[PDB]
Structures are given as structure tokens and as C-alpha cells.
């Protein structure tokens, strides 16, 4: 009977949907904003009081809410992470109208991705992942914000920027990694290569950090010739989005733009308790994009195809509000 | 710790990993000789690299273990996904069978919370039982999941009632007729009738025939919202009323009260809603929220049961008991109802 309870709990689809539904309704923020009754809570969220209580009941049973006084539910320690100002952003990561939780519906067709090795995102939303964001500015922004989370300081501190002149952050996102280098290395100029939409939140984030004279942004496709050369080329959580043959192409473009003596830095999670979140990231890449997490041995193959060699891998990098450690692989020409 | 706990709780990928393993019959294929991923992928027609990434999550959640290098075997928990296991959890997690198919309705849980209305129809085009009425594979699958393959999970509610003075039993919505069978084996003088829908009446007929009981239990096709096909002294409603919103349950109960013989009783076999700080609350809200998104139904408290009965001109005499069943993680009760 212990085994039965364990399997039912593990296989249950209603619990993560309860968490996600609570996040989308901003339930915890409404509690913290003074909604002390279910009546108040249903009004602020425009839901049915009878139905909202049945959701609160599961939220209590899984330890996200507690009933303090009768009919008064407040967040627990774990439940407070759904507050919108919490620096782990777990509410937005669970908001069904934001990009990742909406992407997560691709897991409902996991059998197909396991049969074919292809992502299931397109069969649900009409377009592959990044094409879908390209037509949905709310999701583009939303995804950009999730990706962005001060938090990339560990990778930057794991590399000596003494002899680095120009840094190119390929698929750099909102430019936080580039910013973390500029703060660390006062002599480097940096450039972010990013897609439409993103380049403007990158430009605004870089401006508001006071660094728009240290880091420019260029709109482009990193499968095409890169806009310029550099001594350090940054691929922070990019290649895991791509099958082997597309990652080779990206790496090849980086190699063609690498200055003499330069290095390509890959900031990712090497495939090896932590296994729970490793496999969650890895299967996400399967069903969203057709990508994957890769072992060190697999990394040697990809670099070899690109005419590169894995020079070194700098050990586990810990970050705030992040349950998975990171690595920095340094690549050189073959 | 807090961050890791919320992510585990909120993750969609773990239950879909379990459901994918059950749908591929992964555990059965290991149990049947597939010792390598290669042989596993071929038996399931899956990609070896992709099947391994799924296996890796099944190990992380403790459903498989790496015995020898590259050889994965089920754990004691993982063995519950074997097809002959009497709790039938593989079928319950099979995406092509009725309930795991219906669970997709949870992806629209907000709508159900906003409106109090089930979301099954918006995904599949038809209300739950109308969808089964067009899908013989699903109708059959659902009827087998309610039945359990165990002849004796109905014994506790059946042993909680004295069938001494009972002449005819009407099992309204009695599914495959196991509850009716459990009475006839405890009560040799009793005759029973199962009222069920098209398709199900035939699996109840063949189940009762193979139990040797077709001359003690008959089966009638019908709509329990219409006048019932005959009168009776015990009218059984086992796990039916939770499928229906209040107004429909009152209509069902009213039809039951109209068919009740003098001195007879309507028996309700369900889970009585009760506040709890216990581990069983997880499975209580699972059943209750399934009823919301599948059907618009609900689990009900005793207080709520009192109100339903009075609308139907009935009164709850006694609630007979949190009868605990062997190897079932949810408590059932038997409410005894008589006319007001
Ligand atoms: C929850 C852990 C992590 O935040 C690690 C990892 O997130 C880490 C690093 C990430 N990064 C910007 C440094 C950020 O600091 C975040 C708060 O923590 C991660 C995550 C998820 C994604 C991604 C992740 O990188 C993606 O990159 C990604 C992508 O590039 C394209 C589509 C989807 C995704 C992701 O879903 C997360 C993950 O591994 O979930 C299993
Ligand atoms: C796992 C516990 C239980 O089996 C209790 C409960 O199942 C109990 C009693 C049930 N019954 C036929 C006696 C059978 O013995 C089963 C193995 O155990 C239950 C369950 C599920 C359903 C239902 C359940 O009754 C339904 O009735 C149901 C329905 O009538 C129409 C659509 C869907 C469902 C259900 O999904 C289960 C439940 O509560 O899951 C949370
Ligand atoms: N063809 C393309 N050209 C340039 N950038 C691309 C691209 N396809 C995807 N990307 C970018 O790759 C990024 C990966 S996710 C964000 C990564 C960021 N460096 C970080 O570590 O936080 C996305 O921002 C996406 O816009
Ligand atoms: N209008 C209707 N008339 C008769 N039966 C109905 C019905 N609508 C739903 N049902 C039946 O109600 C049952 C609900 S589940 C049946 C549970 C079963 N008696 C048991 O305890 O094991 C299904 O078998 C379904 O066929």
C-alpha cells in the first residue's frame, strides 16, 4: 500500500496543474495583499468560491498553503516562493500564460517525442519554439525574463579576462552574461548576438546598467556568418537547444569568427538527487526543441566536428535560486 | 530545499514520464526478457537515445534501477506498472485508456476553477459518458478500470449491511455488476438487477455469467434519470452521485426514491468528504478534482449529503463506516437513506 501511494503520487497530473493554476491566478500574492477569506480570494481572482476552495484543499494537502485560522489560508515556507517578487521567479515559471509553462504542454505528447526523437511543441502550437516566440511578443518578453532571472557571476569569475579584448555573446539573451564580464573586466568591449524582440530588452537592460558604451547589441542569426570576430565567444545555455548537426553549425560559425589565440566558452550543464532536475531540463529540450544535455564525451565529438577541442572544463558553478549546477567548457581550435 | 520542493511539486514532466512508461508497457518488456536498452527500444518501437533519457528520469524517481551496467530493472514501486499487477496502475496510467486520457482535462484547470464547469468536452468534443458512448475501446477500458480485477474490493461495503430481509436489489449504474455479485455471494436468497448504459450492460452480462450468477442477477439497459425499470428493497448507488452536480444527483435520488419498496433503503457507496491533516487527503482531492474537470461532479460532506437527500424527499439514517479496504489508499462509506 506504500508502493501504491508512491506510484499514484508520482503519476498524478492534477498536482502540478494545481500548482500551475495557483501560480496563474496569483493566489499567493492575493493572500499576501490582504485577501484573508476564500470570498475575498475568489473575488480578486474572479473564480467560483466553491471551486477555488477545492483547489486550496489540494494546495494545503501538498504543503503550499496552511489553514491558520478557520477559513483563513496563508502560504507556507514553500508556498511563499509563488509570491511574484520572490527572486527565484517560480510563479512566472509556473504561469500558464508565460512561455515555459505554456511550452510544458508538449509533455502531454511525450510518447511521440520518444518514438521519433523530434519535438512535440510544433504539433501543438503551429510553429517550432523560436518561430512561435517571433510571432508572440508577450511570450518573447516572457521567455526573455525567465532566462534572465548578478546571477552569472560564477561563470565570469571562472575565467581569466586579462588578455581578452572583445567578447561576443552568441545568443546572449538580455545581455546579463556580457554585463557580468564588463563589470569584472574594465578593458573588454562586448557584443550580444540576439534575435528580434530580444535585442531591445537586451539594449534596455544594458543601458539601465550604465554599460551601453561597453556592450552593443546586434540583431542576427547565429547560423549565418557572425557580425564580427572576438577573442572570447560565449555560448551560454544555447547549444542544449539544438540537435547535434545544428550545434556543430553554430560552433563552426563561432570558430570562423575566433581571433588568433581566442577561446569559445560553453556555459551549460554537463550530463552525468540532482538527477531529477538534470532530467527535467534534458527532456524539456527534447520536447520543446529537439535538443539535449550532453556528456563530456559527447562534447568531444561535437567540438571535433567543428574543428575544436575541449581544452578544459571548470568545475561546478553554483548560482542563487538555481537547483542545478553549471559548467564552463573552454574550447580551442583543433 | 524549498526551491527544489516546489519544482518537484510543479513539474509536468514526471507524471508524463510515468504515463509514457505505462503506455509503452516498459516494465512488462523488462519483465519479459528485454535486458538492454537496445532490446527495450525495439520492443517498444522507440528511439534508443530517447528511450534512455526517459529511463534516466524513471531511475531518478525510483521506478527503475540500474542492476548491471546498461541493464535496468523495476523497483518494488516500479513493479506496480506490470500489467498483471492487481492494482492495475499501468492501465490507470495508459494514455490510450479512459482515465489517463481524461486527465488531460487538468491542463485547463483554470477554466474549471473560473466557471465550475468541466473541461472534458472542450478537449474531446463531447461530455464524458457521451464520449464513451461513441468509443467502444474507451467504454470498455473505463468499465474495466472501475471493476478492478479483484472479486473482493466490494466486500467491505457489502458486509456492512444486513441482507436478511432483502428480496430484490437494484444496482443503479452498477457498472460491471461486481457490487451486485458481492451481495449475491453474501446473500443467497437475494435477486439483483443492474441498471447500466449501452455497451456496459454487455460486459456486466458476461461478467455475471462467468461468475455463475446470470440466474440470480439480470441486467437492464436504461437511463437512471428516467423512471427505473422496477421497484426494489435495496437501491444501490455505488460511486455514481459524485459524477453529477447537485441538481442531477437529486434527480437520480428522486428516481430511486420513486422505485423504493415500502420499508426499503437506498444505499450510497462513496467517499464522505471530511477535513483532514492526513496523507489520505492527497487522494481525496485527486478524486474530487477529477470529478470537477471530468464531469462537474464533486465529493460531498455529510452536511452536504443531508441537503441532497432532503431535496429528494429522503433522510440519511446512518453513515455506516470508513470501511478500509486492503491495498486501496482511499476510505469508502455506506450511507443509508430512507424516505423523509
Ligand atoms: C529550474 C532549473 C533551470 O532554471 C536551469 C536552467 O536555468 C538556470 C540558468 C539560467 N540562465 C539564464 C543562467 C537562469 O539563471 C535560471 C534561473 O537558472 C534552465 C532551466 C530551464 C530552461 C533553460 C535553462 O537554462 C533554458 O536555457 C531554456 C532554453 O534556453 C530554451 C527553452 C527552454 C529553456 C528552459 O526551459 C531550468 C531547468 O533546468 O529546468 C529543468
Ligand atoms: C485510486 C483511488 C480510487 O480508486 C478511489 C475510487 O476507486 C476505488 C473504488 C472503485 N469502485 C469501482 C469500487 C474501484 O474499486 C477502485 C479500484 O477503487 C475512484 C478513483 C478514481 C475514479 C473513481 C473512483 O471511484 C471513479 O468512480 C470515477 C468515475 O466514477 C468516473 C470517472 C472517473 C473516476 C475516477 O477517476 C480513485 C481515486 O480516488 O483516484 C483519486
Ligand atoms: N538563430 C538565432 N540567432 C540568434 N539567437 C538565437 C537564435 N535562436 C535562438 N537564439 C537565442 O538563444 C537564446 C537561448 S536562451 C537565453 C540564453 C542566455 N544567454 C542566457 O544564458 O540567459 C534565446 O534568447 C534565443 O533568442
Ligand atoms: N444515464 C446513466 N444511466 C445509467 N448509468 C449511467 C448513466 N450515466 C453514467 N452511468 C454509469 O455510471 C457508472 C459510474 S462508475 C460505476 C461504478 C460502479 N458501480 C462501481 O462502484 O464499481 C458508469 O458505469 C456509467 O455507465
Numbering used by the authors:
A (entry chain A): 14 to 162, 166 to 288, 293 to 354
B (entry chain B): 15 to 354
The authors write:
Similarly, DnrK RTCR is adept at carrying out diverse reactions with improved acceptance of 6. The structure of DnrK RTCR with 2 shows that the sugar-binding regions R2 and R3 no longer interact with one another, since the presence of the L-rhodosamine unit of 2 has driven R3 away from the aglycone core of the substrate. The displaced amino acids in R3 remain without a defined secondary structure, which will likely provide a higher degree of freedom for the substrate to re-arrange its position.
